[PDB]
Structure formats: C-alpha cells, structure tokens
Design a protein around this ligand. Structure first.
Ligand SMILES: O=C(Cn1c2c(c3cc(Br)ccc31)CC[C@@H](C(=O)O)C2)N[C@@H](Cc1ccccc1)C(=O)O
Ligand SMILES: O=C(Cn1c2c(c3cc(Br)ccc31)CC[C@@H](C(=O)O)C2)N[C@@H](Cc1ccccc1)C(=O)O
Ligand SMILES: [Ca+2]
Ligand SMILES: [Ca+2]
Ligand SMILES: [Ca+2]
Ligand SMILES: [Ca+2]
Ligand SMILES: [Cl-]
Lengths: 364, 364
C-alpha cells in the first residue's frame, strides 16, 4: 500500500471517520483507522462495532493498492499538525506505516487490516433523499427530549418515522416529548425505527451545511446515511417506542400566545428560586396576562408578570421550568403558542407561526 | 437597608466580587455576598477567609443605611437575567431581602451581616502603581511554570519581586523556571513576596484592560490591589522562594535562533510519538540545522529537521517536550533564541528581540 495525498484532502475525511472512537474500545484494534487503497481510491474507516464511518478519497497521485490500520488519534494529529499545503506520503513498511512530508518523518505502529472488524452487509427496506437542512431541523427540534439513561434504554434515542410524504422525529423521556415532521416530496412506506443517541450525534455531525443532499437507507436493524463522499452506518435500538399520537392532549382548547424571548427570560429568572431538584414553577393564566411564580425550601420566592394574548378561562398549573426552558430554547422564534386544558393535563407548545414541531410537557 | 441602582452600575461590581467565590463554600455564609449601605455608598464583599473582594458603588437614588448578606450566585443571576436598563430596587424585610424590577419580584434569604467574617486590618509596607497591561504581561509570562499542589507549598505560588524601578515575577516547579521583569518608573525598595495560586488567578481576573491604573500595597502577610472602585486582597505564602539568579545558565556559549512558530510546530509534531509519561525528545544541533527526534516504547518514531540560525560546536541534548512547548506558547513572538551550554546543562530560552522574559528548562 502506498499513497501521497495533499493534507487538506485528507484532513476532513480523517476528522469525520475519527470520532467516535469514544475512549473505550472493546478491542484494541478499534482504536485504529482502517486504510484501504483500491482502484484509485483511499477508503478510511472507523468503527465501534455498532456504528461505522467510511470516507473515500480519490487518489490523483501515484499509489499502490493494499490495506493496514494505524492509531487514529496519532495519525490524525500528525496530519493536522503538518503545515498548510503539505503533501503527505504514506507507505506500509513491514509492521510500520511510514508517513513523510517535507523533512518531517513518522513511523506509526500498525495492526493487520485482515484483523479489523468488517460489519456484515445488510439490505435496505426503505430509502429516501432529503436536504441536509431538513435532517438538521428534524434532529435539533427533538434531540433535547431524549432520555439520558443507559446506552441501551429504548428512550435514549430518537424515533425516525416515515409516513406518506413526511419524515418525522420523536423524542421523549416519559415526562416531556418533542415531535417534528417535515415533508420530503416522495411517498414513503409506513416505517419507524429508533436510532441510538450516539447515532443521532453522528447524523448531525456529518451535516456540513452545503450543496450535498443526504441519502438515507433503513433496514431491519440498521440505518445508513450518505453525504458527499462519506457513509455513516448505525445499529438501531430494539424496543417498542411510544405513540406520540397518544400523548398529545386531546382538546387543548385554551390558547395563549406570547413573545418567545420575553417568556423565556421570565421563566429563566423565576427558575433561580425554584427547587434545585424538582424545578417546579407555577403559571397563573388570566385575560391577556401570565404570572409565573417559583419558590424553594429556603422560602425564597420569585414572581414574574407578562402581558400575553389570552382570552379563555383562568387556570393555575405547575411545570418543571427546565423542561419549559428546553422547549423555548429549541424554538428560537418570535412568538410561542401554549395550548392548555386544565391543571392536571399536559401542555402543548408550538411556534405560533408553524405546526411542524410540537412539544408536550406534563404538569407537576 | 435600602437602595435602588441601575443594572448596568451593579453588574460589573457583582461579577468582580462574586465571580471568584465558586461552588463549595467552606462555611455556609461564605456563599453569600455582604451588602453594606453607608455614607452614600453600596459596598459588596465576597471572601473565602483568605482572599477578599470589595467593590463600592455610589448611590445617587434614595437609600437607607444598613447591612445584610444574600446568596451571591442567586443575586448575581437575578441581576444579570433582568433586562438592560432595569432599575433594581432592594429593601430588607425581616430575614428576607426583597429585589424588585419592573414586574419582576424576588425574595432572597439572608444571613446577618454581623456574622460575616471581617478580615483583620493590616499595615502596608511597600506600595507602587503600574499599568494593568504590565501586570497582565508579568503574570502570563510566568504563570504556567508554577508548581501544581507540590508539597513544597512555596512553589505553588508566584514570586513578586521589586528591584530598582522594576517589578519582577518568578515561577518554578523544580524542573523549569520562568522569570519576567518590567520597568514601572518608581524607585522601589528591594523586596519579594509569594502570592498563592488562587491570588494570582484573581489578580489576573480583576484586570479589564481599561485606563484605570493598578495600585498595589504589600504588607508582611498580605497583598492588596486596587483598580477603580474594586479592591482585591490575598494572603501571602509564608516561605522561602528559590533565587532565579542561581538557576540561569552562567555561561551559555551556544546560541541558536529560530522561527518560534516553526520550532513549536516541529516540537508539537514530534511530541505525538514521544513517551507518554516522560515526553523526552532529543535535539541535534549543527550548522544552521536542528534535528528533533522522538520515540516511544512501541518503537514509533518521529523526526523533524529545521533550518535555524546556528554556528558553533555540534551537540545533542534531551528535553521534556511539554516544558519546551509551554515556553514557546508563552513567548508569542516571531523568533526565539535558545542558549545552550552542553548536554548536561539547562537551556535558557528567550524572545530573540527581547530580554524581558527568560525561561530555564533542565535537560533529560
Ligand atoms: O406513565 C407515564 C405515561 N407516559 C409515557 C410517556 C409519556 C410521555 C409524556 Br410527554 C407524558 C406521559 C408519558 C412516554 C413513555 C411511555 C412508556 O411507558 O413507554 C409512558 N409516564 C410516567 C413517566 C415515565 C414512564 C416511563 C419511563 C420513564 C418515565 C409517569 O409520569 O409516571
Ligand atoms: O536540584 C535542584 C532542584 N531544583 C529546585 C529548583 C529548581 C529549578 C529548576 Br529550573 C531546576 C531544578 C530545580 C527550584 C526549587 C528548589 C527547591 O526545591 O526549593 C529546587 N536545584
Ligand atoms: Ca462491511
Ligand atoms: Ca408534527
Ligand atoms: Ca476587614
Ligand atoms: Ca528578566
Ligand atoms: Cl421577561
């Protein structure tokens, strides 16, 4: 194996395939990247046995086919630490990989490519394409509502659901829920799968924000995303994800509209004097007015009064202010609509201007 | 006690005094700020029993004298979360402190001011003033060479030495040393004190890069710095500091000059394949050339060759790369000079264009 590649053609591929690579490999060789030269292309692979990231780099300079594996972090750091414009010449030399550029030289240890885990081929059952912006919107709208449990917990991940012409994400921890649906202009079979937290992070991380659209393939137990010259594959989480349709409040007839930024600032101040563990605040809704109160075991008290648009019946309701703040911070919009029923029912929150995301928060 | 002040006249003082407090107060009241109204002034004080931070704010609006203490972070967080231009109206009501602005209202718990630890008055023995930029330079030049939690408690601080018309800092951990001297235009008595790590951090933090000069007063067991209407006081470390004049190479015959960034990047690359515990690299110096090599126990090897300015006998010498890189990162200059004697002697490193900072690193 031999190749020479200009540094800035190697750097982004290395960064995308390296990470993670999350500190605790279950086999030593998983701390290495797999390098493969074949048919004019250098392929770079990183994996933790569950997810896999593969980058392909076209080789325009002289090269020789073959494969090896080298420590990912060290190889990345050597390439990154070389100056702008550096040509990076690599050759396999026995049990070492030699890296040369200018008058810099590095001999890295290798482990055989034949020993690197090769994840089984699988068959896609659903495929679609979408703009990167749409995927980014879907994830950012819901990601914060996933449970923070052990890795295999069924709610520690994001439901991805295809239905008609839309892709939908759902995330929940059993107390609050986020759901976002976006049309993608292709009619799709009914299907839903759970992508683990770590998979969700990589789907986001692979979005550069450019011309390149995203191509997604979903199988029985895996999902695959292609963008430009990169392919990411993740295992799915086994589990029965809850039905968001059953958690939306049936008749959230009482509608309050407020400026998102003023509402957020008011909740943020009140939160300071809320119970540090339970984070409870009380909302008092009345005609064109919202009153937010908080108190804590030290008998400290906060009160905020805001003008809002509201003309239904008065009511009082308790919420976890962190959950409410998470929603307002995810919305990043001018006005918010809070859709209320009564003191013992959940609230549904939406950008006043768009129903494409909804958030459900249970009262305390 | 009552006062009303604009948010923008309260925020900086609160940040100055409360910023240093951090989590884990050693006694509950040390989590509180002391507020005192007297003679048309609000004073705000935070302490950990050894250092103390006091800011004075002039009260132009109606006020009433008195004192209380309130949780520092909560009061600061409330003041910061209020909008720009908020009038902040404060009133003591029993064992609670009332804070009101617009339609935001808060009630904080108090602890009596009479119970707030008052640090003893002490007498100034050496006084001088200097620009903030100068103090910043002196600390940044040397801070990284301070020991970290060494049993030789005296090495965990920074020496401040007055000699002639210069203020000097020195820091060393027993393996490397940094010294910086700057003229300040006053005839100073010859004197030196050790400021503890936490005191150095606050000295740096209180700098704002405005026109306000820094006024320093040194006592037998304390130091005070005034900038504008802010006063920081720290205990000194009672111990005997090394004499930097004994550590500087007496006769470093071999001078090597090099681009700082080039040298730094070469060392940084070679460091990747240095022993992870001992971080040894070797330098081979010859006519206008420096070769750097690193190897580790897995038989990985790096080599870097640089064009540098050097005429003199050829020599080899080993260094901890981290110590060399710390210096090169501290210098922030175009060219560096390394002053060498032989393989068993320390090296002195300086900016090639200024002798105001010097660094000594022992060979391996
Ligand atoms: O029983 C339920 C009903 N439930 C449930 C979910 C949920 C989401 C929202 Br926004 C409101 C109510 C929801 C989503 C998780 C559902 C499940 O059992 O898989 C149960 N919730 C538990 C919370 C909980 C259930 C399972 C796991 C964690 C927390 C409770 O409030 O006692
Ligand atoms: O043998 C020594 C150890 N030592 C010591 C210091 C020092 C500084 C440098 Br750059 C190199 C070695 C140093 C300064 C700290 C001295 C002490 O232990 O009090 C000892 N003298
Ligand atoms: Ca495979
Ligand atoms: Ca929706
Ligand atoms: Ca005092
Ligand atoms: Ca000096
Ligand atoms: Cl507000």
């Amino acid at each position: 194996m031999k190749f020479t590649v200009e540094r800035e053609h190697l750097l982004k591929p290395l960064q995308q395939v390296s990470g993670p690579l999350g500190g605790r490999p279950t086999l030593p060789i998983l701390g290495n990247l797999l390098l493969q030269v074949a048919d004019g292309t250098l392929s770079l692979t990183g994996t933790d046995l569950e997810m896999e990231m593969v980058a392909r780099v076209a080789l325009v300079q002289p090269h020789e086919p073959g494969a090896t594996t080298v420590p990912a972090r060290k190889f990345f750091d050597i390439c990154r630490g070389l100056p702008e414009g550096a040509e990076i010449a690599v050759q396999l030399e026995g049990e070492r990989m030699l890296v040369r550029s200018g008058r810099s030289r590095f001999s890295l240890s290798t482990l055989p490519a034949a020993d690197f885990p090769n994840l089984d081929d699988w068959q896609s059952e659903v495929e679609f394409t979408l703009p990167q912006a749409t995927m980014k919107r879907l994830i950012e709208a819901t990601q914060f509502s996933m449970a923070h449990q052990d890795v295999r917990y069924y709610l520690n991940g994001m439901l991805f659901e295809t239905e008609g012409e839309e892709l939908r994400t759902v995330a929940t921890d059993g107390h609050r829920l986020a759901v976002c649906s976006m049309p993608i202009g292709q009619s799709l079979p009914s299907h839903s799968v759970i992508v683990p937290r770590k998979g969700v992070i990589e789907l986001m991380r692979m979005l550069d924000g450019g011309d390149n659209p995203l191509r997604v393939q979903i199988g029985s137990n895996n999902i695959r995303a292609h963008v430009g010259d990169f392919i990411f594959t993740s295992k799915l989480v086994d589990g029965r994800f809850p039905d968001y349709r059953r958690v939306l409040p049936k008749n959230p007839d009482k509608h309050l509209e407020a400026g998102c930024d003023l509402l957020k600032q008011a909740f943020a101040r009140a939160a300071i004097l809320s119970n540090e563990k339970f984070r409870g605040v009380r909302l008092y809704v009345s005609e064109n007015q919202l009153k937010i109160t908080a108190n804590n075991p030290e008998q400290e008290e906060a009160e905020e009064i805001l003008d809002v648009t509201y003309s239904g019946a008065e009511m009082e309701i308790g919420f976890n202010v962190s959950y409410v703040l998470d929603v307002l911070n995810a919305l990043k919009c001018e006005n918010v609509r809070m859709m209320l029923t009564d003191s013992v029912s959940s609230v549904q929150i939406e950008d006043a201007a768009s129903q494409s995301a909804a958030y459900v928060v249970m009262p305390m």
